[PDB]
């Protein structure tokens, strides 16, 4: 009986909320109603297996079980298309299907937000309706939300509108809240689709390397073995999440929670009050958890990986488990290196061995290994320091304007409004992380690249504008950032025309915030960029500040929609003399 | 497992003689035809002369008279003797067999490395290495003033080879020849990662390493 | 007299697309005596049919062979790029030292149009202390091979101190590569300081130049 089985374990309540999450993820254009329905209904029938798990039909896959629910309203194209296909399957190949049909970007309208009242109203009335809703939109709208920590998100969410609901300025303690649990909700939703991606394009090997890196990172004091111990864990818990199998992965997380703050004195000092909290507070905890102080005197690598006379020998034998104590090693001692930038100069060590060991001295091809580290450690810093700088000098929003141009002459393909997003998104990696000394940067800036950097490939995969853009995401996983970074001025590209309605700004303009006003802007300049990208340098630095200009006077000229109507169908060839 | 080598081309000053040598390894090729078949710059291909497993040897019109095939059947090895060499002799020479089976007929399956025959009166000359600094840019380098050709140019020993283009050579208005060999690279590896450009011209044993750095 | 035209000169096809190259020899070659060879740049040539529609061991099937007499055809059922190179085809005719290969066809492929990304290196130091300046001008990875690269030191256009070199079509990405080479005396050099280079090609709406004054950086 396995649906008992993770039923006793879990707890009733997590129990619902993953089978909901499961069924919003799966089904991302089904009513809230629906769902509801299908997921108290799969919960009675976990209760009768409680009850009696050999009673019949309790012994049956979660897959079978989930799957079959899924398809009591899943013969309905009229509303979903193509699920019926999954229904007329057999497991594993129902479920396989499924998976594969998961909308990264639902048709879905963000949900604006209501007032305070108006949600405290809300969830004072039904509070598990509120939280249940919440659930469900999320997990919509982002098909590969880590489910576990979606539980941890909607329990600080509840708790957020239990403290704030019953405070002297409920808005005030409310909002910077819920701004905060969403900054850190689409941060993990993204954080977690480049693991599944890792999973799902590159292998269980590749996880488990960056896993080795990162994991050795953070608990620089544990043995080689502990960690060994854990990412082989922490990869069978994703492997199941990202398979769809929340259930079991949220069960088997509990459980590498709980051996993780059973053994802290053999992975990490930091752990202490993550393992204080409540098992949700807990896992949340110890994945944010710092990194350990490294220990003192750590000795040099090229002993064991360089001068030993088994190097070969051991390089032959086990490759995995001799690589792995190389990352394991170069990474504890790296804090400050990207994850990614670890895994290059494993790479590095492992093509010179792959090289060097079978020649005919091979000890001494392979003397020099760690000196092919130097340039490839520096370039990421100089770039770093460098675009830090210029982040310093332009600020948040003319340093998206510089991105902008760059990454719209890269890829001039690409939908205007994709590009505004995923370069603001990028430009944001300058405030973000050039906040942090050159110790903590890399880490930080270049592992969050990755991240909306996997975003705009997964988003791409969908709808393909450009090969070169095609080629980076599938290439190197561990290189998205380079090979992106690498692309130069694409001359192909024609210019997109020119609508003269495309170049004239309205009265409407005036009445939005001032980050509305930048995309408005920085959108019209990714057309200017796409109706004459090769020839324009900073004369497009120019446009730009004659906009800003202008938009700024006709919002105070006692106008009648006027300074804008006039000074638009007709002031475009004005400035487009240039 | 069968290939032919061949040497002995060169640069040869007109009216001068030269002796291309054809040796095969990995057959016995005493049963065979050998043919002789050169390629000016640029050009197709013309064919010169034969030799059979016998001593029999055929030329085209044009060429008997100046050139010579012979073979050294205790060694393996067929010649190819060039006298009076005038400067439309400056061309790839190869050394191809007849396939077994034929003997007039233009069909020659084993070829040869094929060797590259400079006739000019002119003075064998290095070739100077200069870096064309980068501005993703690239760089490369700059490989002026040689004689006669071939040159061959590499990036970092090797190392580096995608994005590399080594241009065709040219003869400079001063009669030397010239080319440039650039790569592209990542901008932000400038400076942290270092670029050599591997120079080597044989027929004046010259070799270079030139470093290409930006500039300023 | 013997006299073998091979023809189109050269000619450039899509992938999966037919090409086919003639070669008409004047005396009708002697009995089947027509050879068929595919020389890869640097490489050398390589049998590919012989007897006019014999292929040999190690030939693509898509090579064919076809004609008789005075006429001979070479056809590639289905272009691969591996197939870029210059063919060409060797006949006999009875005098055997009167053995004649074809003009021979230069095969290219098709791929979508794409501008040259220009660079522009002004002259090394250590090249100046020789008193001689060489400014290139690199047109990387393109397509059609057609451009054109005209110089332009402060204003003035050039002409008669530039030679330029291109390589051939990639074997990646189907593309040419440009280098455009101003050479001029020291003293010529330093008299100047607006060095540009102005690119024409079918992939531009508008022709690009990439200069630099020298000294500044």
């Known amino acids: 009986s396995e649906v008992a089985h993770r039923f006793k374990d879990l707890g009733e309540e997590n129990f619902k909320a993953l089978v909901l999450i499961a069924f919003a993820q799966y089904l991302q254009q089904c009513p809230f109603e629906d769902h509801v329905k299908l997921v108290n209904e799969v919960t009675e029938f976990a209760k009768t297996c409680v009850a009696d798990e050999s009673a019949e039909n309790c012994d049956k896959s979660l897959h079978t079980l989930f799957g079959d629910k899924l398809c009591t309203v899943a013969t309905l194209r009229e509303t979903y298309g193509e699920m019926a296909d999954c229904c007329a399957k057999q497991e594993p190949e129902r479920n396989e299907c499924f998976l594969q049909h998961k909308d990264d970007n639902p048709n879905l309208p963000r949900l604006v937000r209501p007032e305070v009242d108006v949600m405290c109203t809300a969830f004072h009335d039904n509070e598990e309706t509120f939280l249940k809703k919440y659930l469900y939109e999320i997990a919509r709208r982002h098909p590969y939300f880590y489910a576990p920590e979606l539980l941890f998100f909607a329990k600080r969410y509840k708790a957020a509108f239990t403290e704030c609901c019953q405070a002297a300025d409920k808005a005030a303690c409310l909002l910077p809240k819920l701004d905060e649990l969403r900054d850190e909700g689409k941060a993990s939703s993204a954080k977690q689709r480049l693991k599944c991606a890792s999973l799902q394009k590159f292998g269980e090997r590749a996880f488990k390397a960056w896993a080795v890196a990162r994991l050795s990172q953070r608990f620089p004091k544990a043995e080689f073995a502990e960690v060994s111990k854990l990412v082989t864990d922490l990869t069978k818990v994703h492997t199941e999440c990202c398979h769809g199998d929340l259930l079991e992965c949220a069960d088997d997380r509990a459980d590498l929670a709980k051996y993780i703050c059973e053994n802290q004195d053999s992975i990490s000092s930091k752990l202490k009050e993550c393992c204080e909290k409540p098992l949700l507070e807990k896992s949340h905890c110890i994945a944010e958890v710092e990194n350990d102080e490294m220990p003192a005197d750590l000795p040099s690598l090229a002993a064991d990986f360089v001068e030993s006379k088994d190097v070969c020998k051991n390089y032959a034998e086990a490759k995995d488990v001799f690589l792995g104590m190389f990352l394991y090693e170069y990474a504890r001692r790296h804090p400050d290196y990207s994850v990614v930038l670890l895994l290059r100069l494993a790479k590095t060590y492992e093509t010179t061995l792959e090289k060097c060991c079978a020649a005919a001295d091979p000890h001494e091809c392979y003397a020099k290994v760690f000196d092919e580290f130097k340039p490839l450690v520096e370039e990421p810093q100089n770039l770093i320091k460098q675009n830090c700088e210029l982040f310093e000098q332009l600020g948040e929003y003319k340093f998206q304007n510089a991105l902008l141009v760059r990454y719209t002459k890269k890829v001039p393909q690409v939908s205007t409004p994709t590009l505004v997003e995923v370069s603001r998104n990028l430009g944001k990696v300058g405030s973000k992380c050039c906040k942090h000394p050159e110790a903590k940067r890399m880490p930080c800036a270049e592992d969050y690249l990755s991240v909306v950097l996997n975003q705009l490939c997964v988003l791409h995969e969908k709808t393909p504008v450009s090969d070169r853009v095609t080629k980076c995401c599938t290439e190197s996983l561990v290189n998205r950032r380079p090979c992106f970074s690498a692309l130069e001025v694409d001359e192909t590209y024609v210019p997109k025309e020119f609508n003269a309605e495309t170049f004239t700004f309205h009265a409407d303009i005036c009445t939005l915030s001032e980050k509305e006003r930048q995309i408005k802007k920085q959108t019209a300049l990714v057309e200017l960029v796409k109706h004459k990208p090769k020839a324009t340098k900073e004369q497009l630095k120019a446009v730009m500040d004659d906009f800003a200009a202008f938009v700024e006077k006709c919002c105070k000229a006692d106008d009648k929609e006027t300074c804008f109507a006039e000074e638009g169908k007709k002031l475009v060839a004005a400035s487009q003399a240039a | 497992e069968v290939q032919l080598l061949e040497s002995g081309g060169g640069l040869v000053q007109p009216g001068g003689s030269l002796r291309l040598s054809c040796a095969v390894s990995?057959?016995?090729?005493?049963?065979?035809?050998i043919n002789w078949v050169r390629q000016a710059p640029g050009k197709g291909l013309e064919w010169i002369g034969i030799i059979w497993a016998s001593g029999t040897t055929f030329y085209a019109t044009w060429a008997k008279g100046r050139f010579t095939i012979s073979r050294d059947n205790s060694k393996n090895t067929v010649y190819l003797q060039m006298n009076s060499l005038r400067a439309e002799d400056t061309a790839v020479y190869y050394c191809a067999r007849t396939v077994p089976g034929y003997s007039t007929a233009p069909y020659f399956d084993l070829w040869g490395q094929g060797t590259l025959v400079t006739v000019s009166s002119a003075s064998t000359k290095g070739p100077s290495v200069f870096p064309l600094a980068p501005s993703t840019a690239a760089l490369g380098c700059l490989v002026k003033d040689y004689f006669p050709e071939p040159v061959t140019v590499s990036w970092n020993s090797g190392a580096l080879t995608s994005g590399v283009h080594t241009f065709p050579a040219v003869l400079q208005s001063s009669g030397l020849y010239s080319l440039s060999s650039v790569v592209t690279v990542p901008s932000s590896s400038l400076g942290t990662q270092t670029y050599i450009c591997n120079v080597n011209h044989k027929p004046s044993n010259t070799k270079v390493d030139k470093k290409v750095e930006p500039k300023s | 007299d013997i006299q073998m035209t091979q023809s189109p000169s050269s000619v450039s096809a899509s992938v999966g697309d037919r090409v086919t190259i003639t070669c008409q020899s004047s005396?009708?070659?002697?009995?089947?005596?027509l050879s068929w060879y595919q020389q890869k740049p640097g490489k050398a040539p390589k049998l590919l049919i012989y007897e006019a529609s014999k292929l040999t061991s190690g030939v693509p099937s898509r090579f064919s062979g076809s004609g008789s007499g005075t006429d001979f055809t070479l056809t590639i059922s289905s272009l691969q790029p591996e197939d870029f190179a210059t063919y060409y085809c060797?006949?006999?005719?009875?005098?055997?030292?009167?053995?004649?290969f074809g003009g021979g066809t230069k095969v290219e492929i098709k791929r979508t149009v794409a501008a040259p990304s220009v660079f522009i290196f002004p002259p090394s130091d250590e090249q100046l202390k020789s008193g001689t300046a060489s400014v290139v001008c690199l047109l990387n990875n393109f397509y059609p091979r057609e451009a054109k690269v005209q110089w332009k030191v402060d204003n003035a256009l050039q002409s008669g101190n530039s030679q330029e070199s291109v390589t051939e079509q990639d074997s990646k990405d189907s593309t040419y590569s440009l280098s455009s080479t101003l050479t001029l005396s020291k003293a010529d050099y330093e008299k100047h300081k607006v060095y540009a280079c102005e690119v024409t090609h079918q992939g531009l709406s508008s022709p690009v130049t990439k200069s630099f004054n020298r000294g500044e950086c």
């Open positions: 060797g006949g006999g005719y009875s005098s055997i030292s009167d053995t004649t």
């Open positions: 005396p009708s070659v002697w009995s089947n005596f």
């Open positions: 990995g057959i016995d090729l005493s049963n065979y035809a």
